[PDB]
């Protein structure tokens, strides 16, 4: 799964089976990292109009 | 893939199914790759 974003701590109580999370666009918004099984929230990097 | 979804619920109804809502969490995602068309459940006898 490829993508760009900032990985931050989260307070979403994922169930054991649950691995990732999806937004309305179906783009991944949270992910469970392998090896350490922790849940990292994925927030898209800041952008806007110059 | 043979998916087993399971849920355990504490109930106190005597005869029929209880009326309520309980979502089944996925328990086992099983890699078999075989044809299944017929099944049979296993019970346990009591001997005296
Ligand atoms: C390796 O990953 C598995 C699950 O993917 C995990 O249970 C295990 O703790 C990991 N080991 C190390 C050394 O990170
Ligand atoms: C499974 O077996 C039945 C007959 O036992 C057959 O009709 C069916 O096509 C088979 N399916 C597969 C995917 O092999």
Swiss-Prot record, chain B:
Tell me what effect the entry lists for residue 14 to G: In strain: Omicron/BA.2, Omicron/BA.2.12.1, Omicron/BA.2.75, Omicron/BA.4, Omicron/BA.5, Omicron/BQ.1.1
Reported effect, residue 23 to V: In strain: 20A.EU1
Q: Describe the effect of residue 14 to E.
A: In strain: Omicron/XBB.1.5, Omicron/EG.5.1
Domain of life where this protein originates: Viruses
Glycosylation site residues: 35
Quaternary context: Binds to host ACE2. RBD also interacts with the N-linked glycan on 'Asn-90' of ACE2. Cleavage of S generates a polybasic C-terminal sequence on S1 that binds to host Neuropilin-1 (NRP1) and Neuropilin-2 (NRP2) receptors. Interacts with host integrin alpha-5/beta-1 (ITGA5:ITGB1) and with ACE2 in complex with integrin alpha-5/beta-1 (ITGA5:ITGB1). May interact via cytoplasmic c-terminus with M protein. May interact (via N-terminus) with host bilirubin and biliverdin, thereby preventing antibody binding to the SARS-CoV-2 spike NTD via an allosteric mechanism.
Q: What does this protein do?
A: Attaches the virion to the cell membrane by interacting with host receptor, initiating the infection. The major receptor is host ACE2. When S2/S2' has been cleaved, binding to the receptor triggers direct fusion at the cell membrane. When S2/S2' has not been cleaved, binding to the receptor results in internalization of the virus by endocytosis using host TFRC and GRM2 and leading to fusion of the virion membrane with the host endosomal membrane. Alternatively, may use NRP1/NRP2 and integrin as entry receptors.
Q: What is this protein called?
A: Spike protein S1
Its source organism is Severe acute respiratory syndrome coronavirus 2
Full-protein residues shown:
200 to 247 of 1273
């Amino acid at each position: 799964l490829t993508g760009t974003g900032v990985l931050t701590e989260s307070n979403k109580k994922f169930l054991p089976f649950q691995q990732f999370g999806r937004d309305i666009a179906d783009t991944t918004d949270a992910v469970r990292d392998p090896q350490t099984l922790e849940i990292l929230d994925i927030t898209p990097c800041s952008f806007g109009g110059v | 893939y043979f998916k087993i979804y399971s849920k355990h619920t504490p109930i106190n109804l005597v005869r029929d199914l209880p009326q309520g809502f309980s979502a089944l969490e996925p328990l086992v995602d099983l890699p078999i790759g075989i044809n299944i068309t017929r099944f049979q459940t296993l019970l346990a006898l009591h001997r005296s």
